[PDB]
Structure 1
């Protein structure tokens, strides 16, 4: 930045991206294939495999 090259900060910060990954991990272990195609449903992971 002292020579004129401006680095713009990204819109998605590290805590929001980490929240989306943990939100997707907790969703994938919950509804599996369901929440991508619609509302999330409770299914046990033992019946998911």
Structure 2
């Protein structure tokens, strides 16, 4: 309820990098370090 209450001017911005891209980066590092 509080998360929907913050209409006094306080917001939260979304990160530029989505988790599905961090997962891709981690997979690339794992493949490189295992191959």
What's the TM-score bracket when you normalise by the shorter of the two chains?
A: 0.5 to 0.7
Residue correspondences, number: 29
Relative to the length of structure 2, the TM-score reads: 0.66
Relative to the length of structure 1, the TM-score reads: 0.51
CA RMSD of aligned residues (A): 1.1
The gaps in structure 1 that reach 5 residues or longer are: 30-49
- Following TM superposition, the consecutive aligned residue runs of length 4 or more in structure 1 with deviations greater than 4 angstroms are none
The gaps in structure 2 that reach 5 residues or longer are: 1-5
Identify the structure with bigger relative contact order (alpha carbons < 8 Å, sequence gap 6+).
Answer: 1
